[PDB]
């Protein structure tokens, strides 16, 4: 039952706040509310509690991550470079 | 208060030091021997009149038994 | 159909006064104030949402009246931790001490040659 043509979660705002602002906030409104796969348990229970706080519903192993996503593309390459520097020339 | 079901402990409580008051309440197929103490009020109920007519005399004398009604 | 009144000087429906209406032997309804419900203690580092079992859930100042048998569990870490985390800590301690023994004998067997 397709109810909306293009607008998704940001359909709650209605006709206000403009069009491009809703289009830009929808991209992260999709992510900040979608459940993620727990890297420790293995289930899709990673609802965020607050800004940057993501706790699981099974083992409750809380992790600090991005504000709107579980991990940021900047922190990914930061961790990669940290590992590379650790392995190079024995830390 | 405290309800008493056995036949051996109510008399032990009635022969205590703080058993100043003992009252008898007659009801329809019910007889209640309420012994008042310093903290509680022990109540023993019985449905047989034969077990009550022979037990009323077993109370220690001098305790000022008051037959209600 | 019968509207009653408060019994104390408090006139605001705050958290200190929670009234439940009850019927007296005198055939009339009246408020009675209820003590705030006490929650059972929760374990330390154990299961988070699950409270401890076998421990009386009542206000803190009431615990002076309760007996020790109604405030703890017979096992170790009775009223402080849950059942799962106790055996978890037992296994963890035993295994890490065995690993320390293993690394010690490994250092010894390496010293015997080098």
């Amino acid at each position: 039952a397709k109810r909306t043509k293009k607008v998704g979660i940001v359909g709650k705002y209605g006709t206000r706040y403009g069009a491009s602002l809703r289009k830009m906030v929808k991209k992260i409104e999709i992510s900040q509310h979608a459940k993620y796969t727990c890297s420790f348990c293995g289930k899709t229970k990673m609802k965020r509690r607050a800004v940057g706080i993501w706790h699981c519903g099974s083992c409750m192993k809380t992790v600090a991550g991005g504000a709107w996503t579980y991990n940021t593309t900047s922190a990914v390459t930061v961790k990669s470079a940290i590992r590379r520097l650790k392995e190079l020339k024995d830390q | 208060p405290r309800k008493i079901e056995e036949i051996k402990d109510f008399l032990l409580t009635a022969r205590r030091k703080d058993a100043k008051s003992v009252k008898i309440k007659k009801n329809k197929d019910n007889v209640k021997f309420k012994v008042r103490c310093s903290r509680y009020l022990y109540t023993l109920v019985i449905t047989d009149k034969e077990k009550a007519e022979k037990l009323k005399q077993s109370l220690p004398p001098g305790l000022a038994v008051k037959d209600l009604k | 159909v019968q509207r009653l009144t408060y019994r104390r000087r408090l006139s605001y429906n705050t958290a200190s006064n929670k009234t439940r209406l009850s019927r007296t032997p005198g055939n009339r309804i009246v408020y009675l104030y209820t003590k705030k419900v006490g929650k059972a203690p929760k374990s330390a580092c154990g299961v988070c949402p699950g409270r401890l079992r076998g421990v009386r859930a009542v206000r803190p100042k009431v615990l002076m009246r309760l007996s020790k048998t109604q405030k703890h569990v017979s096992r170790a870490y009775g009223g402080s931790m849950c059942a799962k985390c106790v055996r978890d800590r037992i296994k963890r301690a035993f295994l890490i001490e065995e690993q320390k023994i293993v690394v010690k004998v490994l250092k010894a067997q390496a010293q015997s040659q080098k």
């Binding site: - | - | 096992r75 059942a83 301690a93 035993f94």
Partner: protein, 134 residues
């Protein structure tokens, strides 16, 4: 098939949680009244306290007084250990059927107490008698 009546076995869940039990008789197939596999064991209840050079013999004799117990346990509630205690436990006094009689249980516990202290005083297998800090 490694769990034998010789090795030491920790107790995970129960009143005697982690009390250094040793198996007296293990039943892997299970009885009729107990479908789960189990193992009747005997463990130490109160570990002996520390002894020193300043504490006299009258104090060492008081510290060496230990309390034991006998109990059947499920394999899921116990963890085996590579250590072993080589003490002879005659199956006549310690039996699976003594759990129906308090005097027989007292006799079995009193036998286990002396069986444990005679191995404790000689100093062999101190790991079995030292308390596990958890």
């Amino acid at each position: 098939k490694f769990m034998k009546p010789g090795k030491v076995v920790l107790v995970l869940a129960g009143r005697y949680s982690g009390r250094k039990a040793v198996i007296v008789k293990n039943i892997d197939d299970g009885t009729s009244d107990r479908p789960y596999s189990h193992a009747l064991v005997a463990g130490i209840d109160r570990y002996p306290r520390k002894v020193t050079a300043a504490m006299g013999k009258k104090k060492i004799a008081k510290r060496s007084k230990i309390k034991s117990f006998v109990k059947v346990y499920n394999y899921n509630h116990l963890m085996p250990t590579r250590y072993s205690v080589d003490i002879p436990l005659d199956k006549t006094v310690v039996n699976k059927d003594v759990f129906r009689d308090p005097a027989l249980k007292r006799k079995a516990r009193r036998e286990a107490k002396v069986k444990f202290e005679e191995r404790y005083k000689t100093g062999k297998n101190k790991w079995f008698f030292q308390k596990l800090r958890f």
